[PDB]
Amino acid sequence: PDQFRAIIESPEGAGHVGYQYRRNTGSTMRMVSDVLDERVSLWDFHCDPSGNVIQPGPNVDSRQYLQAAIDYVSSNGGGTITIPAGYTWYLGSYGVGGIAGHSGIIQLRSNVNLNIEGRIHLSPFFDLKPFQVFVGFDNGDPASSGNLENCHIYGHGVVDFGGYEFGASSQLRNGVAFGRSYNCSVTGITFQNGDVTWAITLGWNGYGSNCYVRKCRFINLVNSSVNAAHSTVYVNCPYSGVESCYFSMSSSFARNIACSVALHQHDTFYRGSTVNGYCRGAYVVMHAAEAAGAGSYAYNMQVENNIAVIYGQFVILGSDVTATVSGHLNDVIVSGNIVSIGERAAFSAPFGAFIDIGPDNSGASNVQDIQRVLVTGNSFYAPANITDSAAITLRANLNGCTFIANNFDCRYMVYNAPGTTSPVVQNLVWDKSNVIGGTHANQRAGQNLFDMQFASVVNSTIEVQLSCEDLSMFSCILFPASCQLSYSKITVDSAWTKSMSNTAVFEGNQQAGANVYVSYPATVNLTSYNTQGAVPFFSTDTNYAWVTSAYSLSINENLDFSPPATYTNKANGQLVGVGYNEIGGVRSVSVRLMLQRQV
Amino acid sequence: PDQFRAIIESPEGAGHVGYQYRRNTGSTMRMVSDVLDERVSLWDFHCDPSGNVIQPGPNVDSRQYLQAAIDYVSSNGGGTITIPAGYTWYLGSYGVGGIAGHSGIIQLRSNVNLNIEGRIHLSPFFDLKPFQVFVGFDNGDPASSGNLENCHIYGHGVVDFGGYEFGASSQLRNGVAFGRSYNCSVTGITFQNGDVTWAITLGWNGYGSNCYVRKCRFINLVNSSVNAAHSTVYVNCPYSGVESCYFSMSSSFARNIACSVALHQHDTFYRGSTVNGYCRGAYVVMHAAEAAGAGSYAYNMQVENNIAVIYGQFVILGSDVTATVSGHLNDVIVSGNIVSIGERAAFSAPFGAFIDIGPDNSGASNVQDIQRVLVTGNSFYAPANITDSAAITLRANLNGCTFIANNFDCRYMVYNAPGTTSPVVQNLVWDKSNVIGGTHANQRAGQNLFDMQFASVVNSTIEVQLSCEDLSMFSCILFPASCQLSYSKITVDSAWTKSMSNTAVFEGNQQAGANVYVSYPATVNLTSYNTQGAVPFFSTDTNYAWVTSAYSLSINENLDFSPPATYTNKANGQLVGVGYNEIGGVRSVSVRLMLQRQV
Amino acid sequence: PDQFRAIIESPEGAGHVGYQYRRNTGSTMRMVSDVLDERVSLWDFHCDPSGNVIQPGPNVDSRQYLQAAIDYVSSNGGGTITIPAGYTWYLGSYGVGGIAGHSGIIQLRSNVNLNIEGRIHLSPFFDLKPFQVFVGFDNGDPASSGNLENCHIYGHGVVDFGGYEFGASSQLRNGVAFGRSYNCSVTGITFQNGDVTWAITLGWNGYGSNCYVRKCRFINLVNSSVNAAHSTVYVNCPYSGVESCYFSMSSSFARNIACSVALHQHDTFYRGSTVNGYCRGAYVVMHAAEAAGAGSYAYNMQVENNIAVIYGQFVILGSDVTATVSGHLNDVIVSGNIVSIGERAAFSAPFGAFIDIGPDNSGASNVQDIQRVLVTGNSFYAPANITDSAAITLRANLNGCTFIANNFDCRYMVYNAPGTTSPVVQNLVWDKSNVIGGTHANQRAGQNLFDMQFASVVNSTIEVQLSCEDLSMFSCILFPASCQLSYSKITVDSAWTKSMSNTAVFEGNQQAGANVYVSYPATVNLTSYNTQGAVPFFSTDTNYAWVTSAYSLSINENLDFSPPATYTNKANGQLVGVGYNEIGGVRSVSVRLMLQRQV
Numbered sequence A, B, C: 001p002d003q004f005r006a007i008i009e010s011p012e013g014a015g016h017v018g019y020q021y022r023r024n025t026g027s028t029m030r031m032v033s034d035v036l037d038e039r040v041s042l043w044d045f046h047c048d049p050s051g052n053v054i055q056p057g058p059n060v061d062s063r064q065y066l067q068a069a070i071d072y073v074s075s076n077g078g079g080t081i082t083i084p085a086g087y088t089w090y091l092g093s094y095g096v097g098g099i100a101g102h103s104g105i106i107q108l109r110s111n112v113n114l115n116i117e118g119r120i121h122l123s124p125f126f127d128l129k130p131f132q133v134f135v136g137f138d139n140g141d142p143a144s145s146g147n148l149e150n151c152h153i154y155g156h157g158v159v160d161f162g163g164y165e166f167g168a169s170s171q172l173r174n175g176v177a178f179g180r181s182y183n184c185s186v187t188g189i190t191f192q193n194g195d196v197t198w199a200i201t202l203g204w205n206g207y208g209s210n211c212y213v214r215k216c217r218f219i220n221l222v223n224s225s226v227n228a229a230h231s232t233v234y235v236n237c238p239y240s241g242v243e244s245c246y247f248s249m250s251s252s253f254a255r256n257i258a259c260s261v262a263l264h265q266h267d268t269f270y271r272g273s274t275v276n277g278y279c280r281g282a283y284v285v286m287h288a289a290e291a292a293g294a295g296s297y298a299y300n301m302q303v304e305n306n307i308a309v310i311y312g313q314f315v316i317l318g319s320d321v322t323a324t325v326s327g328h329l330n331d332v333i334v335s336g337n338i339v340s341i342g343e344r345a346a347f348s349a350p351f352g353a354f355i356d357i358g359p360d361n362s363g364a365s366n367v368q369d370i371q372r373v374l375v376t377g378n379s380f381y382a383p384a385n386i387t388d389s390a391a392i393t394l395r396a397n398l399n400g401c402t403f404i405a406n407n408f409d410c411r412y413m414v415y416n417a418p419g420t421t422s423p424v425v426q427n428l429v430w431d432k433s434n435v436i437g438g439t440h441a442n443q444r445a446g447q448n449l450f451d452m453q454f455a456s457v458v459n460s461t462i463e464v465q466l467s468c469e470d471l472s473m474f475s476c477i478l479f480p481a482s483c484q485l486s487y488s489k490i491t492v493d494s495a496w497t498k499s500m501s502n503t504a505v506f507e508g509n510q511q512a513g514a515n516v517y518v519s520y521p522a523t524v525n526l527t528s529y530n531t532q533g534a535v536p537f538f539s540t541d542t543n544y545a546w547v548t549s550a551y552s553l554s555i556n557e558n559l560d561f562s563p564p565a566t567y568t569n570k571a572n573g574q575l576v577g578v579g580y581n582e583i584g585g586v587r588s589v590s591v592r593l594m595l596q597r598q599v
């Protein structure tokens, strides 16, 4: 009996109290401790050396206790540790061993899930220092790390980075680095109040698979001029992605340095998410330096059905090389997104764009291999004052990109800055079903809507269709004489162009190329012979040697004659057609024509 | 020892039985009560004044017990209360205090989540009365309410409204009113068997953020002629939305009064959901009267990837004004939806439409500021008998809407009823990539496919492309003389139009406008001069003064001559072109031409 | 007192230890056993006849214990049974009763959910045998089965099929057969390591509703030449679907026999998922033999926003008949998908296709009723060597399908094999906004890009637009003389076609049909009369009786004359137009023209 009371009050007491489920005589005859052992929480490890529970709080460092919990549950083949609601659990020191090379705080372990219902905060020990809060590598050298498998972080709780600024731009900070990560995920968690490099990284240089970030919130994760750069989620393993997340920043620095997602391996996605306050939406990039685990190609890349207010570029495409590996990007889709450039002064943030074809990290524009991209069914808007806004800023070599059935309402459609890079362009396709908005009408003095500042263009299609007038623009499309143009189709629909001085401009007369197919409106002065009856009209100018046919876009105010409805050319570069003189006489008219070459 | 047995059997007994997790000597030395205190259920509060548990059932009012649970868990900083599976928990009285002004039953509190695994039912005390089952306001006046934060309702359970009808049309009923709600959500729950105004409302007049409804079912939530109106989810805070839900109604009244979602603030979405039996899919509206918390603009509005069978309109756009605030709607995307009008008689429910540009609640059509809308990649079908079916019913002023790459298979493409409203239309863009289906071929006697019953149209594009014949229709597009038309492009592709009497009709001869760009087929009678050789042909009629060129759509059955291939006009309004008389003689022909103006 | 110690140590002991939540005097005075009874796990039933717990393992058959758990929890109105983490639970025998007719192992029951956190494995008793692991039918004859309602399987755990091959091709294997299933779902689970027919089936012949598969992984579920066929999820009830799943196969047999999803009833969807290694993406089919529970029509079918690498066809459409029922498929949308054919030899797997219009299970091509399909905003790629790759393989009767704003980069656009089936085609619409890629340029000797090997085509549109040259192809579009063509529009844009010998080919001269609307480029030899001045030019050939107009696509190298810009025809089939001889003389020229008929 003394024994008994003593046993009951001891830590083995629950192990002596019997239990059978719902008094079911067919159920297991268990002890209370067995049922309690089905679950586990931080309270089961958050104790002093004598076993007495310790209350969390800002003067208590919870790190060792949470690590002890993870270590133990790992030793039993896994389970889910609850981080209890109603408390804030502070972290106040660095971890040890394999995660120390990563500035790690907690080491994650395979099959050990964290159900974060309460709050995890960083103590001021971390102020001005690097850190990665949760780390799944088990070695300081990621190349020598084991894998992290089957690790899920989820719940209604919060990771709060304490508001601390970076101490130096060279520092790195992260929330969750899953490492070489297979079937890992973060769901439901709010990451907030920091100055960090990433909130979550998935994978390592292509090693990993099936990692996801779903229904998470990321709020105010950049706050200082020290922060070098930020991507809220960096996706560095295949078959992985981000869905239904919320990203918000409020700091000015974020408008210049921060991106919501980086998709950096094949079969990755970003969908259904909302972004506000960031410079950039998503990078879609194959870095050769990251090609170890899944190959040198980033393919099956999906950015779909997002909502964004950004200050720089929505999707940024890239690929690059190292001394021994070449990176390639292909088979991309960008669809269903509704994006705007937020209110800002012209040139006050990185050049506004829906798609950017960006140079590598060294600024090289001649290393890229980007092709088979489909941009369809998106909307883009930039306010009228934002000069630096484009459907595409095409700033590095491009091996193909297709635009179908978008609505682009910004300053430029196609842009690259002159005297910068001279990209080599192939297979740029701009379908006629792209709707060009009117917000920037009257703002385009001196500017070309499609400003083709490239080394060369081949196998490309630009079908310009206006939907309102903008007589301020210099031209709808312009090719400098430095840009070769071949095996291409360039058209300017005549609607809303009657009063334009210039429609398409070929400063090197490139439209004469053998395999160039063009059409655009022009005004032409003609003069007829004096004969009564069928009578020829000829252009006064001789710069139509390339024209295969032309037709009238003008009415004929005359009763006594009519100019030709249609024209062809002559060897001397004049247009010629047969009109009709009811009464004879030399006629002189100025007519608006659709000039056509091989179309 | 007596002490001991007594202590063990008392409510403090579990607090005396020790426990250590898995017999781990490094774990906390706890008591059983500590581990049990990690969770909480309704059973912990569902007791009489002596502490004896009460069984739920239809004669027991569970309200006070659930409120006591919520109140207590709130006092500890939050947690999750389980509503146990295997039981039905009846609610049978109104709450008290701040929620009484809202006819509230339960008051939600911040950080207190409800895991509803069992069923919550309404008792007949609520029959013929108003109610809001869960309310997150803390004050009868929402303007004086505190916020509700971090409150999630989730699980496999059910909210059942008892089937009771409304007592009066002026009454309001709701499931969950989150109030001024920040990071709140409903997930997994079935709402069923009612006559209610809303199932869920998010936010209050723009106050709130990050509220969501995900994987919920709403079944049979309207059942009587008393019910004034119904929106299953009303989204009245930004950065919030509905995803992957199921909405079904079976009552006839629902086909006339019910909508699945209302998106009423910026950065809101409705996606991936299935609707059956409703009048309407979604409202997308900025009410000036709701502009307090997030501004006067509804922007970044997304309706994507839904499946619907409805009886009225799929998406309804609106904006309005108050005495001192003006509401604006812009930057909308409607994409990927597959929608039909369900089987019904013509005119038996509100006018069928994929998009409706609706007048305000007073019927005013001259207050709206709706622009920058993209409608792309959707399908719409209405059965052939449904006269009242349109791609767009454009019934109020429109400042822009773009249609690209849709498939519309219904009676009308563009419609507004004559002698009703006379909307002022700008920037209506109907791209040629919109496919017009053939289900209503042969049903269109007396009707215009695009019936342009507007005050005016400017900066608009209508590119009509048929894909089968319908010789029953009066015209492909018709503008009454009352409609001004300027700075617009209107084309009718000739395919399937050879036998149409009328293609495009301009009852005020508006196609002559200086900045109108048109083309469409017409039949024209011509007569030539008698001269052998090149010889002119002239139209007998003189109503072609606006024509810039025309070309043959007809073969020439003759050997001895040919009419011109192409024509222009003369000051008197005749067409003229130069054909060829192999042998002389006056010729008279009737030819099908493509008439072109400035295109 | 002896009593007392004995009571405490007995299975009723926890039922004597009091508990009150957090020492709250307003809370229920309960016993520990009451709180423990709020949850249930397999441990509560996994015991020998004396009540002693049994450890799971490969020599222990857990089946009877899990069934006993499900049976008991069912008897209390439901709940959720946990399958504990950290253990592998082996199944080693067949179930009994109603599921034996289905080779069932476990019988699911209404309102009883399974939270699978650990692993469920099949023991080698099942090697070479049929099985269905979880079965929701309650009768061997599904027609006589009751329903399964409100049953959810979810968690981070795993179902492992043991790697065992099928014993015979006629055998069936499944993971979860929900049966006649209403509000059932599988979420989060990994199904792996098998040779099975299905992983999950939803519904039975249209009976069921609201069943879903979300965030599941299916890995390596086909492994042998014995396996007849495989669909990873078969959706056989309405208002149901698959979202955000991952499907991977590695076996060669899978490339020939396996499909990820089968959508077989109305209001069903497949979205946001990633597929690798399969033959097929999704079937979308109405089998008449499955029409009992939800009617004879499959409508509101959605395949959207998926990523796939497959070896055969992405979406396969079908409908068929039985002796007394006819199946119909309509109102389908296929949007936003990014798909490729994986690296393979030509003809090494089933014919590669984005859409296939497939014959019934007997090979009949004359039973189908498929219409109102929208295919928009997708990308498709096949490597250049894959001869057997098409945007659409149209192999059975088609009543309509619309393609808008896709990017197809493969060998064929439209294909059917000659001398096979002769489908009857109506309402095939290929919009000009479909972008035709260049990967297969130079590979197309002897081949037609659009190979119209049909019995007949009516009410169809083919608007061919190239975006690069491919002079290897025989023609852009070809109709054999056996194919009737009427009430259709067929155009070939001239861009990149100057050097093509053949553009459009009508081997039966079908383009002359009264209601055929065509245009395409051709080279034509002309000769003029000798007259100075306006002078006629006539084609030497007489096969242009069908031409309504033609215009020049060639420049005029001459100074002394010009050919006509535009032409019409004469009764003898010559073209004729009026050019200009500055000086007289008979002229002879060869010109590239755009030939037009009724356009």
Ligand SMILES: CC(=O)N[C@H]1[C@H](O[C@@H]2[C@@H](O)[C@@H](O)O[C@H](CO)[C@@H]2O[C@H]2O[C@H](CO[C@@H]3O[C@@H](C)[C@H](O)[C@@H](O)[C@H]3O)[C@@H](O)[C@H](O)[C@H]2O)O[C@H](CO)[C@@H](O)[C@@H]1O
Pocket: A101, A102, A103, A142, A172, A177, A197, A198, A201, A203, A204, A205, A229, A234, A236, A287, A289, A290
């Ligand atoms: C090529 C490369 O190292 N890739 C890293 C990736 O690095 C990014 C880089 O691609 C670019 O976007 O600039 C940012 C700026 O922050 C990153 O570079 C910075 O970080 C890397 C990686 O840090 C090292 O490796 C981590 C795995 C360790 O945890 C960390 O302690 C550190 O040793 C560094 O090498 C650069 O010098 C530094 O400028 O980042 C992703 C995501 O973390 C990673 O998966 C990839 O390997």
Ligand SMILES: CC(=O)N[C@H]1[C@H](O[C@@H]2[C@@H](O)[C@@H](O)O[C@H](CO)[C@@H]2O[C@H]2O[C@H](CO[C@@H]3O[C@@H](C)[C@H](O)[C@@H](O)[C@H]3O)[C@@H](O)[C@H](O)[C@H]2O)O[C@H](CO)[C@@H](O)[C@@H]1O
Pocket: B101, B102, B103, B142, B172, B177, B197, B198, B201, B203, B204, B205, B229, B234, B236, B287, B289, B290
């Ligand atoms: C302008 C406005 O009041 N907005 C309310 C919104 O009201 C809708 C209204 O926009 C329109 O759609 O008609 C319906 C018909 O039911 C609603 O009007 C009805 O309800 C409102 C709101 O009810 C008041 O305010 C609630 C917050 C309280 O809980 C309730 O007790 C009541 O005091 C009412 O003022 C109208 O007179 C009545 O006709 O409804 C949404 C969603 O509830 C709300 O967020 C918004 O403020």
Ligand SMILES: CC(=O)N[C@H]1[C@H](O[C@@H]2[C@@H](O)[C@@H](O)O[C@H](CO)[C@@H]2O[C@H]2O[C@H](CO[C@@H]3O[C@@H](C)[C@H](O)[C@@H](O)[C@H]3O)[C@@H](O)[C@H](O)[C@H]2O)O[C@H](CO)[C@@H](O)[C@@H]1O
Pocket: C101, C102, C103, C142, C172, C177, C197, C198, C201, C203, C204, C205, C229, C234, C236, C287, C289, C290
């Ligand atoms: C018409 C039909 O039976 N439909 C079944 C469906 O059957 C598919 C069939 O549509 C086609 O796709 O071939 C596969 C090849 O595996 C299936 O046929 C095979 O299975 C069926 C169904 O199996 C019977 O019915 C199940 C409900 C029982 O559980 C099972 O024990 C068996 O009695 C069979 O009749 C065929 O002979 C066999 O070749 O399969 C789906 C999904 O299971 C089902 O819902 C539908 O009724």
Ligand code: NA
Pocket: A101, A102, A103, A140
């Ligand atoms: Na490091």
Ligand code: NA
Pocket: A454, A455, A456, A482, A483, A484
């Ligand atoms: Na150059």
Ligand code: NA
Pocket: B101, B102, B103, B140
């Ligand atoms: Na009120």
Ligand code: NA
Pocket: B454, B455, B456, B482, B483, B484
């Ligand atoms: Na008017």
Ligand code: NA
Pocket: C101, C102, C103, C140
């Ligand atoms: Na069977």
Ligand code: NA
Pocket: C454, C455, C456, C482, C483, C484
């Ligand atoms: Na035939």
